Design a protein around this nucleic acid. Sequence first.
RNA 1: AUCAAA
Length: 95
Amino acid sequence: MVEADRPGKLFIGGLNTETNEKALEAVFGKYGRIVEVLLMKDRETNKSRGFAFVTFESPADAKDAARDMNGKSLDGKAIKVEQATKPSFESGRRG
RNA sequence: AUCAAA
């Protein structure tokens, strides 16, 4: 299954545990007008899962970020930037 | 390793 949840949504893996949404809007907002930002975190420490997501208003403002910020760093920790895929903690059922 | 949303 090759799935990509529409242009403009990025996957931001390898982030610091100290990074949050404000740093993620502030850093990816440098490439395009953000419409949404995600930052994934532990449910007992509310830190970070070490990866996040962001939605741009243009599918190519996200390309310009995913062509600049990819392989760089956030809060001192090296990251990946790419078009986002769908989650994998859940699967189809019944039928 | 810079690997995916509870």
